[PDB]
């Protein structure tokens, strides 16, 4: 069935690098961030992941909304742990026309 270019063995060592779940009404997918990582800074990783705005993506965990200064840690997510997302959809539009280019070698 479905195929992915893979070319590369577990992982190297890490400090406090944690794995989340995001769950969502469309679909789920695990991600990588330390525990001191924000929740605002989560957003914009499952922004592209989802290809949603990190400005309507919402975090709940143990019944409560994920605060920004409130680190994974900080909110009681682990190495292991889920958290259901839910997109507000609250975007009508396709971002902004600009050339997207990026540094050179370095």
Same mark, same amino acid.
Request: proline fraction near 8%; aromatic fraction near 2%; hydrophobic fraction near 30%.
């Given at each position: 069935?479905?195929?992915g270019s893979?070319? @590369?063995? +577990?992982?190297?060592?890490d400090?406090?690098l944690?794995?989340?779940?995001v769950?969502?009404?469309?679909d789920?997918?695990?991600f @990588?961030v330390?525990d001191?990582?924000?929740? =605002?800074? $989560? ?6 992941? %989802?290809?949603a705005?990190?400005? =309507? $993506?919402? $975090?709940? %965990? +143990?019944?409560?909304?994920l /605060?920004?200064?409130?680190s994974? !840690? =900080?909110?009681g997510?682990?190495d292991?742990?889920?958290?259901? $997302?839910?997109? /507000?959809? =609250?975007?009508? !539009?396709?971002?902004?026309?600009c050339? !997207?280019?990026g540094? @050179?070698?370095?």
């Amino acid at each position: 069935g479905s195929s992915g270019s893979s070319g @590369s063995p +577990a992982p190297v060592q890490d400090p406090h690098l944690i794995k989340v779940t995001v769950k969502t009404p469309k679909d789920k997918e695990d991600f @990588s961030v330390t525990d001191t990582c924000t929740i =605002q800074q $989560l957003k914009e990783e499952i922004s592209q992941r %989802f290809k949603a705005h990190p400005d =309507q $993506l919402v $975090l709940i %965990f +143990a019944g409560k909304i994920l /605060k920004d200064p409130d680190s994974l !840690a =900080q909110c009681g997510v682990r190495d292991g742990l889920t958290v259901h $997302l839910v997109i /507000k959809r =609250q975007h009508r !539009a396709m971002g902004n026309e600009c050339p !997207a280019s990026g540094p @050179s070698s370095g």
